[PDB]
């Protein structure tokens, strides 16, 4: 096994070290570059949300509800529970004539410290429409209603909406169903685990579909729906996360060149449209990147993901400098003195 | 290298894994048991506070200020900034005729979520007197004043109070000065790094001194002051951390049998008085334990420390059941469904 780490220091003395796993793949999933174990069996968590949004959009009758691109971005979101996220959740419930009591997700403290601070100040108790996954849950309810399934158990494995998700995830990964494992997420849905490179593969396919659409190429229904998802995420990145959030700031900086999505417990996935940068990396099409920090540290994840974009030449120094606060996280003590930093003793291998 | 981990799962699928280092030492620092690398060079951070309290108590003239056992517990503390912590900081400043403006530490969000909630509700901005290190800083101010040194720079490495700290830390570790490295902490004091087993050695010497004092043995002023520090921490565990904090709950459960202290970025140190448990572990005196979680995760630290006490037979099932919430942290989702767990595949070696 390779020894790929992100390391924090205090005055040059090792504080913490964190093992890094990464895969960089082409549009067919061929491995181009790796850190750590690029095939590590990994819980995709919320980084599977674009695959789940594809299952929702490929459910016949869902188009009749009139979900717009910001609604689709919400289906793809781990949102901050800003007022705009909660309002959009309730508007999406209205489009399908369902209620908050139909949701099978629960409230939680906001993923945004600033939102959560304002909640704590007002003694706000979050409810199901406040879930960071509320968009995905409304989409799954929409799919259940559309096929005339019945809604009470839309979240259970035996429900056709979860059968459709499970098949769709295996298909995008190019895996047999038995090579995908399932647990239960914080939002109370089935959540998949598969080799980390296949999370890269999903995002390479999303960006590849965007390339095919933009170029006016004939597309399958699946390619057209993947291109729609890419467009929705890139056009409404504030729905995918929120103000100050990595995914939002990343996708704003890149202005359509890529989409990126957080997985809880420090996974990350990026889908990169074909560019001079992807060609210099040795592929003629789109690219996928997937990352896992073995110990689950989010601050380290955003630092490593930003470092990998710099290493791979994706964007310009100017575009990437919008993410400087995440790339080289502040180590300023209570008296304003910088006490250390973050280092990246890992080596991309081809 | 040994492969000693604590692991979290979702539905039996690996989520995160965390590398554990631990040393179990006798009263002289002889290694009895280990996990990972027991000599890992480690920033002791707040777990060095008892060594710093010894430097303070050994400073000529400090005895004249009349610091009591709760004051000494606060010198040893990473407190929650409860009102009683702030009050005792102010009382200690008054004993040395100093003001809050003399402190060279800064305010920070409370180490207690409940305290920080009350602060957020009242728009409270924490100041120097609120620092989790405020007791250590008052003690260092006391030392500087007591020997007629300048007070303005009591926190600077060239100040005689910090020369006393540096020498004292190396002496308790049985190390030459050059074998201890120094950085700057969050509170803006010099902070040491030394092999992890020597953190265990410090706490074994604390517990050994307590045993010597209790038995009415003639003691040096250093051994008597180590005994006093142990007794202060054991008698005032609420000063060392606060309500609901691991160190307070651990030391209350053990009712004098041991002292325990958190280091920032997930170190831990325990000093165990001679007992039936220490004798079953193959030593005739007191014992020291030191732990580091390589990636810095606090929840995993408390889980591991509790599991290690169970494996070492320290306490009874009844004593250790007070720590159940830390030993096997809850993995219950937003809908009340248990989605995962914490496992300890590490193996103690002799
Ligand atoms: Zn979810
Ligand atoms: Zn401190």
Numbering used by the authors:
A (entry chain BBB), B (entry chain AAA): 3 to 352
Give the original sentences from the paper that presented this experimental model.
Rhizobium etli, a nitrogen-fixing bacterial symbiont of legume plants, encodes an essential l-asparaginase (ReAV) with no sequence homology to known enzymes with this activity. High-resolution crystal structures of ReAV show indeed a structurally distinct, dimeric enzyme, with some resemblance to glutaminases and β-lactamases. The active site of ReAV, deduced from structural comparisons and confirmed by mutagenesis experiments, contains a highly specific Zn2+ binding site without a catalytic role. There are two Ser-Lys tandems, all connected through a network of H-bonds to the Zn center, and three tightly bound water molecules near Ser48, which clearly indicate the catalytic nucleophile.
The orthorhombic (OP) and monoclinic MP1/MP2 forms show similar packing pattern with solvent content of 49.4–52.6%, whereas the monoclinic form MC, with a significantly different arrangement of the dimers in the unit cell, has 53.2% solvent content. In the close vicinity of the Ser48 hydroxyl, there is a characteristic, almost tetrahedral pattern of three closely-spaced water molecules w2, w3, w4, visible in all crystal structures, except MP2. On the other hand, Ser48 is not always hydrated (structure MP2) or the hydration may be incomplete and even different in the same crystal structure (triclinic crystals, not included in this study). In structure MP2, the side chain of Ser48 has two conformations: one as in the hydrated state but with H-bonds to w1, Lys51, Ser80 and another water molecule (different from w2/w3/w4). The second conformer of Ser48 is rotated ~110° and H-bonded to the N atom of Ala266 and carbonyl oxygen of Leu264. Except for the absence of the w2-w3-w4 water triad, no other structural rearrangements are observed in the vicinity of Ser48. The different hydration state might be the effect of differences in crystal vitrification prior to X-ray data collection. However, in our numerous collection of ReAV structures, we also see cases with incomplete or absent (MP2) water triad. The corresponding crystals were grown at different pH, detergent and salt conditions, which would certainly affect the protonation state of the key lysine residues and, therefore, polarization of Ser48. It can be hypothesized that in the crystal structure with no w2-w3-w4 triad and with double conformation of Ser48 (MP2), the hydroxyl group of Ser48 is not polarized and this structure shows the enzyme in its resting state, between catalytic cycles.
